[PDB]
Design a protein around this ligand. Sequence first.
Ligand SMILES: Nc1ncnc2c1ncn2[C@@H]1O[C@@H]2COP(=O)(O)O[C@H]2[C@H]1O
Ligand SMILES: Nc1ncnc2c1ncn2[C@@H]1O[C@@H]2COP(=O)(O)O[C@H]2[C@H]1O
Ligand SMILES: Nc1ncnc2c1ncn2[C@@H]1O[C@@H]2COP(=O)(O)O[C@H]2[C@H]1O
Ligand SMILES: Nc1ncnc2c1ncn2[C@@H]1O[C@@H]2COP(=O)(O)O[C@H]2[C@H]1O
Lengths: 401, 401, 401, 401
Amino acid sequence: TYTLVWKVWILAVTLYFAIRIPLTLVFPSLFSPLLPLDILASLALIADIPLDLAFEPTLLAPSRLPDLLAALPLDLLVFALHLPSPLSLLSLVRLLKLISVQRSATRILSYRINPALLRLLSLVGFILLAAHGIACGWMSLQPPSENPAGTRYLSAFYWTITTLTTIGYGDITPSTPTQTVYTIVIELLGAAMYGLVIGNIASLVSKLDAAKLLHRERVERVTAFLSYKRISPELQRRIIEYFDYLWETRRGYEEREVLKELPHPLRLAVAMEIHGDVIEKVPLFKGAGEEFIRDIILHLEPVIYGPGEYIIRAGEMGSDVYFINRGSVEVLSADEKTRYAILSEGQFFGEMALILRAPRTATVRARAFCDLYRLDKETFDRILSRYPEIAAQIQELAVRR
Amino acid sequence: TYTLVWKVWILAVTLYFAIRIPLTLVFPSLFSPLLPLDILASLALIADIPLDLAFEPTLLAPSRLPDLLAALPLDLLVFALHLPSPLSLLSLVRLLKLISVQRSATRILSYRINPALLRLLSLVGFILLAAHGIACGWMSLQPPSENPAGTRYLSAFYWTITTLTTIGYGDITPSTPTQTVYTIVIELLGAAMYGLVIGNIASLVSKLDAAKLLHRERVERVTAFLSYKRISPELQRRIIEYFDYLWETRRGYEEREVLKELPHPLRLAVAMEIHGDVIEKVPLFKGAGEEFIRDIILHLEPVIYGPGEYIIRAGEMGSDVYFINRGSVEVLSADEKTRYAILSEGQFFGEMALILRAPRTATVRARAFCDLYRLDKETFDRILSRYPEIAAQIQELAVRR
Amino acid sequence: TYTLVWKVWILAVTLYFAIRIPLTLVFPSLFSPLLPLDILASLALIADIPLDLAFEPTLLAPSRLPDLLAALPLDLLVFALHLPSPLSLLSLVRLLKLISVQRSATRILSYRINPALLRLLSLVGFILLAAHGIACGWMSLQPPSENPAGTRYLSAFYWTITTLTTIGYGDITPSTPTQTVYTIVIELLGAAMYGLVIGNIASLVSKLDAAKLLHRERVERVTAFLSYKRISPELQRRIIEYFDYLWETRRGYEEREVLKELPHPLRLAVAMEIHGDVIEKVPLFKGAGEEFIRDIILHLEPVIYGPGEYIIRAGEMGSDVYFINRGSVEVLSADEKTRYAILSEGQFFGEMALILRAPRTATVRARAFCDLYRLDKETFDRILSRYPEIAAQIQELAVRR
Amino acid sequence: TYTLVWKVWILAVTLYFAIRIPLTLVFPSLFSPLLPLDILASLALIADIPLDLAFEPTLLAPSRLPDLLAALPLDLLVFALHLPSPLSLLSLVRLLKLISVQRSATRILSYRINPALLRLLSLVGFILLAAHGIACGWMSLQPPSENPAGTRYLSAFYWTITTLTTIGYGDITPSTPTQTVYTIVIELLGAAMYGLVIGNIASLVSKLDAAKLLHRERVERVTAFLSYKRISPELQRRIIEYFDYLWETRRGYEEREVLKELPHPLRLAVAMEIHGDVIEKVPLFKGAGEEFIRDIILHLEPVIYGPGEYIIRAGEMGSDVYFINRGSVEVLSADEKTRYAILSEGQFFGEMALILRAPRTATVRARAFCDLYRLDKETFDRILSRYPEIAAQIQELAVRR
Ligand SMILES: Nc1ncnc2c1ncn2[C@@H]1O[C@@H]2COP(=O)(O)O[C@H]2[C@H]1O
Ligand SMILES: Nc1ncnc2c1ncn2[C@@H]1O[C@@H]2COP(=O)(O)O[C@H]2[C@H]1O
Ligand SMILES: Nc1ncnc2c1ncn2[C@@H]1O[C@@H]2COP(=O)(O)O[C@H]2[C@H]1O
Ligand SMILES: Nc1ncnc2c1ncn2[C@@H]1O[C@@H]2COP(=O)(O)O[C@H]2[C@H]1O
């Protein structure tokens, strides 16, 4: 962090020069009672050279020539020698340090803020600094007057702000050919700057809601298609409330498409974190090796059931086993008159299907949105074929009907 | 809804304060014949504290400190005691309730309107309210005059509107250093506000047509590729009219990609809704269990045939069976001189292919765009292998040639 | 088209009213030498009612009430009776026909133009028409003067155009409280209109190049990844020139992803159009049924070879057969000292691989970008298993070594 | 390049005409001491006709009529004959060459610059040129004055720049009906031009960061989903630092999705470039044919392991073999108390798994981010089935336990 405060000091010295140099060009009465601070400033700006050359691309580099062009005290010379106005503008080389400061900021602070906002903040800072420079430029090429320095600077800053925002009141206007040329030049500059601001704000806003518009558009697409297919309002309302649940819980993201941007080891660690509250107590995987567990966990597919949907129907063959994660379930009878149990988070049903293909013995209805994971029997057999010990033990559990 | 009218009352009291406080700061002649209504207002704004603390994150919360900062009657004190202008601006803490009102609106009404439009409406309301505040601020720092209150408020609102829209006529301009500083500040504010408005409008418009531009661009892509491949105008016109039919019926959405954003139970319910008018009367699935039906319905693939395309050619082996959904079909002979029948919505053809691989006995031509669903024979056998009873019955129907 | 000229006549009568009604409100000296044309206009606007009610949603419809609100001659009454200004503004109901005209245009002409440009054109037309209306409104509430009608209309249109574009010269300004309120209202309107124009232009431009930026970004992605992987400049230049060829020929579109947005019958017809110049003369598919041909054509995968790349290497086993489409090929010897032949568009090589897996007998080098299609041997066997006659004939051709 | 300098000469002559023609219409005192250069210019503009007709679509073409309309000396006639102002405006046909110049530029220079920036540069050039033309137009229709030509041109350019940027000071304003009509027309033109500039800048900025925002949004999506799934901060921090590594190394691009936009031969050449430092020294593929190597290289799947993750666990069966590319590895013992070796870039482990399925003999932990490639045993057997010699040799190496 001792570099991350020296960067702030460098920014402060750069903004000292970018506020003092033009204000001193217009007012030679300065630079006498400010010389020590700017000599300290020059020594600081030359002490940055070894503090970034020792930052583990040598001199005269396409990206490091601005730093050396701002490094040399090319001030302390024109003001000390009192060079005439036509040639003393080259004292402004110190302002080239702003480019290096901006490249620093666009990669140091560019971790915890939206880049389209960092760009806008940098642009606004540069606009304010350029407005100060333009105000000094306008105030330089005016007829001599005995008005104090503070008043005419206020008038100059007022004029440049009313020109750069493209408001243009018209109470301060050019009166001389050179003033007219200057005004044309910075009218073009102000139009460009304001266009840049509007473009940056439009780019910042055009992506301020992303998940919400993606979800909204997928819902519109689904509803248009089902309105074409002539589907009942009851089901076309069940689908709407399912999408409502999806948005309110996980911002509409699809589980299987999100958990696929991860590499295999992080994906496996996430899968263990999730199915760590279930798959240790299943009374047919008990005592199996950890690799069998790690093999049956990467092949669990999620599925969400709304309130009242049939998960399992009594009498049908069935082959799946379901693990409840974030919901609840009621086990009813074939005639649906008795409620055997209310399974909830952590528990599971359908366990007997993996052993043999006996028809289901009870019906299963969701009570709320369940958000549960299912395992097939084809997948279970496929990944059981590689573990002869557990496969033989399950075949034994099968031979008992 | 008794919360959804109290929110409206809270909005009304907040906008009462945000219109009365500055207008009373400029005009001390008020606050005498308005005190009861604003004391009712303060009691209402303090009765909001338990009506959202009992909303099932305690005091001094990063998102609930504005409410308590606007809650305390920090008005009723500066106006009653007639505090001087430099310090009485802290009476404006009541305006912080606007932030809580906006957070309320951006999630209560944020269900049935495009979020990019709700944001624009909130921004426009805030601009009007800030323009009132800025007009009062400008009207405060003017030389004393005997003009009535209504006239100078009209002039102040005129000036702030002609500054905030960046029009800037110039007939009302600063005449004092403090007025010039104020004008600079709100010129910057007006440029920012107008840039925000333009960005919001651009973001709202840049996605006003989505399905249409997606369809248009896929048609351009297809036509460019086939123009490269040197394909006849006849076929490159058949493709254009197919895309025309797709757009005019289902807005260009792909059937198999839309009906895939649904979970398995909702997808199965949609599939039953669609194929509920066909698969109950097929005279070889008759009497089969409901699970067999639910298994053959999830494996039907759609396909659209244009007017005059050959669906089935007499003599070829063939293995598929087609279900007509939203079109019509004519069954012709091998020599294509006799029209056996005109099948339409609900009916089906190719049924004998699933039984055995006898060559097709008649040709089939579309009459309009058909929009029909097909089932393979490999898929039919694959999902028939799991139902020995129906498989044996179909083998019996096969042994009769 | 006799409806598609009556729509133009309706547009002309609507724009006659939207230009005449305000200009007559300001100038009562009209409406005497213009009554017959507007009575014809009213009869035309009432003859539109049966010409769209007989357009194969009855009266008092949410989308057809503007037409009936503009239909009744609510003009011909205020001007004939000379109603006072406060109440005669309701004569403007005829302008509601503009909404129906716009809904007509946004679906009639909305086939052959970019919708983001049709929207902009409609917006610009509405802006010009509203500027005429606003000019008449401003010219109504002015002090009486003896200036001619043409001059004060020029001044009014000048003022409203310099206000709506947010330029605001300031040489024509309000001078009365009612003029100030009017100016505030249309300053807000002009800011909104100009923001709409800027948003529409930004949306129109932000998608003016699509294929080009997609291609450019995929090339940047590829080059960044290979620069990370430290790949030679020679190969990283071969890839660049391959992408150059892709862009210059088919605008960077991927063949297998474009020809997949088509249904199966159109895709098969396109495949026959493309492989119609090759697969009739292959001397082992000769005499096979048309269905075998239609089966081997849908399984041809494209592949592009740059200039000098090895397609087939002598000695390797190999299993594929390649069909030249849009390039050229030279067949060289194992020692690469003799050029046996120069195959070109239409011809094919590797034919003997499908029969048996004898090692390749000669090497094959591309001369230019080839753009050729390949067929496997696994796919060929898979789709040959369903044709016993052709399979037996090929086995016979195989038994001859 | 001798065409690529003649294009620059054509651009220079076109910009000579587009700066001289209006300035000569206003000032007839020119065209006497400039005739030779513009006669050279006309001969140059007529020498472009054969230098693009011989560019390997004949005369009177929809895209080449502007060139012939600018080709004929329709100047050198109105100025020589001194035609009156109403009809001499047709001398401006030379400016139509700008359209051909722009079509040239939008495909010659349109290779190494972002198209949205080339469009903006062309628009800005056209705006400056049109501002010169508009300044000349405004200066033509002014009352006669004895002011010098340079001064009134400065005033005219000042007025047109303050109108086109929508600043509108108001110190130069119309004073005549024709001046008012001209000012209205170019107020509309300036609003359109400035809207175009803002739209182009917004489009240029709205895609200035693409990889960064894609990466940022995928990280937000992942973190929101895992915050919903209630995953530990330790693992939800491991995932964040993995995404940090991905961004800092390869800009967040997915390896398997980037290296899939390439055709098969370029993909194979890239794969050899990458796995050229490993797969020549594996002591069981040694001596195998080059085709076996080229077959095992296209089936290597990448995977990234963070610092400390278990790649291989001692005791588990295991079937994979891993090739280290851009990281490091430490081989530890079953009790994890002894470090056998430190494998690094180029080396590989797990080689014995392909031979037989003996349990792993040591554990393997990453030391830094590894970025290594893995080969299965199912894939190895699948692609070994096609090489009987190498398969037999590996079976021999297997029969030695
Ligand atoms: N009495 C019960 N209490 C809780 N769960 C049950 C009960 N009876 C059956 N189940 C579960 O419901 C499932 C339905 O049939 P299965 O064969 O899939 O296996 C069954 C068990 O998992
Ligand atoms: N006379 C007929 N009327 C209606 N449909 C028929 C007739 N003859 C054949 N078909 C259908 O057309 C199909 C063509 O051959 P298939 O063997 O596929 O099965 C046939 C029936 O489904
Ligand atoms: N003399 C030749 N002229 C043209 N083509 C040839 C010649 N010899 C071999 N080929 C082709 O080159 C192929 C290389 O080996 P194949 O066995 O694939 O089949 C070969 C033929 O298709
Ligand atoms: N002493 C060692 N030095 C380096 N690598 C080893 C050593 N012992 C085992 N390995 C590697 O670690 C792997 C772990 O078990 P495998 O059977 O996969 O094959 C092993 C070798 O690839």
